[PDB]
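Bug #77: duplicate submission created two jobs. Keeping one. Sequence:
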Amino acid sequence: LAESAFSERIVQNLLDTDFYKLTMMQAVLHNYPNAEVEWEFRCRNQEDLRLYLPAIREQLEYLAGLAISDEQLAFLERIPFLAPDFIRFLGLFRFNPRYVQTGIENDEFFLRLKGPWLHVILFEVPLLAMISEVRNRARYPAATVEQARERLQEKFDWLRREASAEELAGFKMADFGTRRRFSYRVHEAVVSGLKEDFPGCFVGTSNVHLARKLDLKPLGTMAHEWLMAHQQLGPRLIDSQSAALDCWVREYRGLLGIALTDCITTDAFLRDFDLYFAKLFDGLRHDSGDPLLWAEKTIAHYLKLGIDPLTKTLVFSDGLDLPRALKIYRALQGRINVSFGIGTHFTCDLPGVEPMNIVVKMSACNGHPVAKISDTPPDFIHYLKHVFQV
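Kept job's structure:
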């Protein structure tokens, strides 16, 4: 009698994705329209996904059928930093199944992407959310929305019965859980729950569709992808990170100013985050390594540049849950502005269910390798570490 956890469609529409995929896509149209890239799906637990191939391919056809509706495109059009040439491009966009290769090799499911960066960028999120939900529809067919709201309420109660109203008035939280959500329906329920009953300050969602549907602010910084691609787009490897930031700021003139620091290592990023960049960007996002040590480094760097930390913002989104996020807030509140982003621990928290450990990582750009090192533990990676001093 309970509401089933699965809706009719898995990927709702062209808006059912993370916002920063669109902002980045626009940056590509305007700056590297003809660049080519390669991506490859990867399951880190070596979970046997072979039986999902049929359904996956079936969803692939569905994706190719998607065309943005006029109401959807108009929603985007109302966003001031989205240019008319880009809006028209989205109006004509269609997923090209020819840029996708899926099947089984070594008795293992595989999925690879190869094509113009402009046309393949939109595959990333939907593919993950889709593979996640087809697995869950097979692994947990009886799953219900009810079960989701339940665990959500438990966590909300914990927060209320833990943090003062004074702390909660400053606890900024966002949803970033599209990619590994249990299902679209669960994701929608979770986000509605956040909007209506989050003890702290719910600031928005990265999911554009839900942002339109629920009337929330679409959120999204920049992705590693942007920083990684620049390793082959033109400048010296050692200048790739600064070139990526430079192009971003030149594209958005100060808007969407939150930069990732771990494409290489936070130390390496900081050595090149000079006054020019420090003034332009409103803040940084933590995605790997210890969050508090990371904060000490970023805050210390601002101080030496003569920048008042309290005028900047630090965004934490490394596999956070409410407890871990609250601890960071309590530790740093008062020293620098902070906000948080929670993903799978929000959109895929069902009793007895374990989120899929999958990713679609960029592997090359214009026929050559690109890589991410991060603060967490071929010859390209060796030279890359070398020029950046590991």
